[PDB]
């Protein structure tokens, strides 16, 4: 978001959240690109899980997660580790949202300069992006959620959940294969 448009269609997509109606503020506004639109939100996803989920970093630690998991998830990224290897919670954020930025610094899947389109494989990176994210939710669901209650930051994650899932449904960016944990909760909302 070069605070351009962009910016405006961020501006958008977090103005129109305050109708309550979660089904319709993350449908494509009339006219606007599908990539554009999913580039965004994706972005603002990106954003806010980080910041969530940096809310509770001391309470996830390298003794308090010895694995990512609930459901185990290891850090194969791609070109750089083509094994999965297990490692810490704490280890596989780090590594994931590194990554899901390089993906959002890399001009070939999202572009600043206007008028260039999207890659065509584009939509299977943002696909992606999201699943990754959406396991930082899981993390932060399973084991510590008391770790938010108890902290201020507790009906935010909620909001930017329900945000996420409704969006993700939406498009079809996220296999229902990988919402099994917290499927209890995409049917309650
Ligand atoms: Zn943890």
């Known amino acids: 978001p070069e605070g351009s ?3 405006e269609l961020l501006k958008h997509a977090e103005a129109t959240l305050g109708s309550g109606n979660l089904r319709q503020a993350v449908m494509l506004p009339e006219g606007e690109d599908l990539n554009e639109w999913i580039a965004v939100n994706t972005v603002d996803f990106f954003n806010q899980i980080n910041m969530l989920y ?12 010895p ?11 791609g070109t750089n580790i083509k094994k999965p290897i297990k490692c810490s919670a ?11 930025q390089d993906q959002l ?37 399973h084991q510590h959620f008391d770790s938010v209650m ?12 329900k945000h996420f899932i409704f969006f993700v449904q939406e498009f079809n960016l996220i296999d229902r294969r990988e919402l099994a944990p917290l499927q209890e909760l995409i049917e309650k909302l």
């Open 5 to 7: 448009h962009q910016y």
């Open 54 to 65: 940096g809310t509770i970093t001391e309470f996830c630690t390298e003794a308090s997660c």
């Open 67 to 77: 694995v990512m998991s609930a459901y185990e998830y290891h850090w194969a990224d």
């Open 90 to 100: 704490p280890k596989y954020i780090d590594y994931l949202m590194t990554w899901v």
């Open 105 to 141: 610094d890399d001009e070939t899947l999202f572009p600043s300069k206007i008028g260039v389109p999207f890659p065509k494989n584009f939509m299977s990176v943002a696909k992606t992006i999201l699943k990754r994210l959406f396991r930082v939710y899981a993390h932060i669901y």
């Open 150 to 161: 108890q902290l201020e930051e507790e009906a935010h994650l909620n909001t930017s959940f």
